[PDB]
Amino acid sequence: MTLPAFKAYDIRGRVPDELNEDLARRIGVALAAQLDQGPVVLGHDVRLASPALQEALSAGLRASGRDVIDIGLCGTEEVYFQTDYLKAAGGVMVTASHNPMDYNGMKLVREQARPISSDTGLFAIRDTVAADTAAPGEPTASEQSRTDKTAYLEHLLSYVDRSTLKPLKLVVNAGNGGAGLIVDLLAPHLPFEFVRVFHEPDGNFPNGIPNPLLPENRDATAKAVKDNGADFGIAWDGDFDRCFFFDHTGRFIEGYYLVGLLAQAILAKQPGGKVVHDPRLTWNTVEQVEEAGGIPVLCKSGHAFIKEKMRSENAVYGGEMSAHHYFREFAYADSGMIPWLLIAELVSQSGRSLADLVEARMQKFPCSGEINFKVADAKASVARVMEHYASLSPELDYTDGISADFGQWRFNLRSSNTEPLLRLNVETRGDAALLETRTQEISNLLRG
Template identity: 65%
Template sequence: MPSLLPCFKAYDIRGRVPAELNDSLAFSIGQAYSAQFAPKKVAVGHDIRLSSPSLARALIDGFLAAGVDVVDLGMAGTEEIYFAAFHLEVEGGIIVTASHNPADYNGMKLVRQGARPISGDTGLREIERLAAEGFRLTADTPGFLTRLDNKPPYIEHLLGYVDLNTLKPLKIVANAGNGCAGPVIDRLAAKLPFEFMRVQWQPDGTFPNGVPNPLLPENREVTAKAVREHGADFGLAWDGDFDRCFFFDEQGGFIEGYYLVGLLAQAILAKNPGAKIIHDPRLIWNTRELVEQSGGLPVMSKTGHAFIKERMRSEDAVYGGEMSAHHYFRDFAYCDSGMIP
């Protein structure tokens, strides 16, 4: 089916601001989501892009006008919306973000209760149609807006994946790319025995060091150089909404994502023997070999977060990974996280 609105993609919303995505359309998306799913309460957050607060406010206004209560998380990473959708008493959520896209872009990722993704096959096309028609839903009683710092329970959830008593005092370079990751790492750092060397730390929607996308070779050297200069044990870098993380070894060498899928699978299978591991069809030899050696069952899925999440749920897999640096966890509502790895 041809797209009615060019910013509506197969799994999310992404487009140039204001030509393809603007405050008026954001309001309509809030209205359309309300009509399609009839939620009583949703969570909304936004990334550090300059257009994000205004788009989030318009989106919230669309929900409120439809009589839907809104929990405003403020600046947040994509996975904080996932966490809110299964941790808080809400029936869905939207994060305003364009992740690693160019600075003049913005977008949205939508989920239902329990952080189930909304894609073209599960309601996004209907939301697009209603938004394109300018559908309006005005409730007799507007929704109620609550502003919430949901980071404390999110941080505690992240810490639940590790045994703090077994962690070594490592020196780690952490490159936030001037995105949303810095404030989360700061809160984690207070509870971890690590020394963090912070790079491009301040959230800044002007992207003074370029759009954060460590998958691009030209964006890796700043992290690699910092690892070498500080004599760090390893380095980490995130994209703008920190749903992807990237690793560098002690010499500043970039570690390809397909190696990490196998390594993470090994670690997780040590605690979950015999479990299923989902992987995408690209460069699978390392993944399948390590999963089978560790007593797990490798299961191949189509590439793409909607396909991976659906397969994770249907197989009840403990972990899933893509070479693009998306890592999915059963205990995180089968969603991807750039912080858990």
């Protein structure tokens, strides 16, 4: 077999059997062999084991003659930003993201923060690590501490016109991850009144692991919004490359609708731009992009696909329904900070509440959200669905899984390549009843 910690887009594993200091050091040696010339940026999240894993990575890199730029405790997006800004050969973020206490991981990038993924160097690194029985060498290169965040903060602030911002009251919930540090550094330069929830970085996670998708964690943000009369609420995962929105009623906003909303915000700044989107849920995004004067560009779902498509198209923005938002000016990388700044500016400038903005689109394009189905046989399950609907002659698209467009409703079905699991998304043209009946019908077919 192979080292299980090496996944499609990153390294994720239980410490210490799937990921540990020796493996981290070997990853550093292997990465040094995979990159073009130059220094390597390292950062880490709040997990208790992250600093030691970073130090082991640093040791391997420096034994291989790589200068290391240690940006310290940070969010994943800061490694992306600094790798590109400092014209480094590459970068690694040590993070467990939203995973349990006994897990950690790494996200690896090369020049311009371009992703290193399974088929673009990550499995090459795996195989090198797997065969590496050499004793650790000693450092032949330096480590420099560079914790200044000024360039990163200035970049974030460049997305909004501060003179147009209103003193919105915003709940912010770092979930005891790292987001609060950035909020606090931005705050003196913004007019917002922040209501801080679970704010202090704490890798023991007294309030639960940082994952706003869990209803219990969701409710802490919702309650704070409602109890404080906030304009809206924002929560992040631990490494803050995903953000999650709550309107003034406390309602958690489905991520699909943020793609169209952020496209509107960006296209006001970059008229006529292209916007890349994924194939799961599409109709609202296409309409909002076109009405804002942009050009929507369909792309397969997945980190590397979206970024590569954006690069090839000079797209200003790319978004997935699953809370990943990518920005051309940000080295084509994802940020959990840029999106809420843009939304706060949109609310400030338009006089419309986030709730009103979202509700209107929800009524036009109701969606199921992504529903997962563990199945005995993915191929047989997809076949039951296709067979059932064949007589209706839907328009089919195989860009990513199977999309079927029936006119007034559509679905996308994607199959996992790591386990037998199907993922379903359904939307309709303004018809909640049709949404429910078709969703339940497909659910029955997938299960039976």
